[PDB]
Amino acid sequence: TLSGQTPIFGGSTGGLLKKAEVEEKYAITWTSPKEQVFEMPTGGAAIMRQGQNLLYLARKEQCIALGGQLRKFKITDYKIYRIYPNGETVYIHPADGVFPEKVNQGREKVRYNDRRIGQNPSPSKVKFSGIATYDAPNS
């Protein structure tokens, strides 16, 4: 699962709302070799600890805007979770342990078209059909 001490943050207003209790809630988890201060994605500034840190955010763009901030503090070990309200913590970033910029094997060409972009079919080819013109199984 997840664990860690929360950073020294004096409370905010841009934090979690009733969506985080009812639908989904994200959690970033990093570790720091320093008692440094960083900028919160929910507005303000907080002091991260020296052990395992743990911060609950509301949506995934707030975690990776924070994850792109820790990479400028030379902290590139963060794990992002997604916490459903029944307690199910899935682990979503980075999925394979490796960052999505550098290539790993076993990964799949998912949502890939084997044509140029300019040779997509016309929307009159797909008239009264279920598919869109960018799905288009020919080439």
Q: Which residues bind other proteins (CB under 8 A)?
A: 10-14, 16-20, 23-24, 37-39, 41-45, 47, 58-62, 64-66, 68, 92-94, 100-103, 105, 107-120, 122-125, 127, 132-134
**CB of 68 vs other proteins, minimal distance in Å:** 7
Which is closer to other proteins, CB of 1 or CB of 108? 108
Q: Is 21 helix (H, G, I), strand (E, B) or coil?
A: helix
Q: Which of 114, 118, 138, 117 is nearest to 126 (CA)?
A: 138
Q: Residue 62 and residue 44: Cα distance in Å, rounded?
A: 13
Least separation in angstroms between CB 54 and other proteins: 18
Please, what is the minimum distance in Å from the beta carbon of residue 32 to other proteins?
Answer: 15
Tokens 């009159």 correspond to what residue? 124
- Least distance to other proteins, CB of residue 13, Å: 5
133: three-class secondary structure by DSSP: coil
| Residues recorded for the chain | 139
Nearest-approach distance from CB 62 to other proteins, in angstroms: 5
What's the CA gap between 127 and 66, in Å, rounded? 44
Is residue 46 within 8 A of residue 56, CB to CB? The reply is no
Q: Are 25 and 113 in contact (CB under 8 A)?
A: no
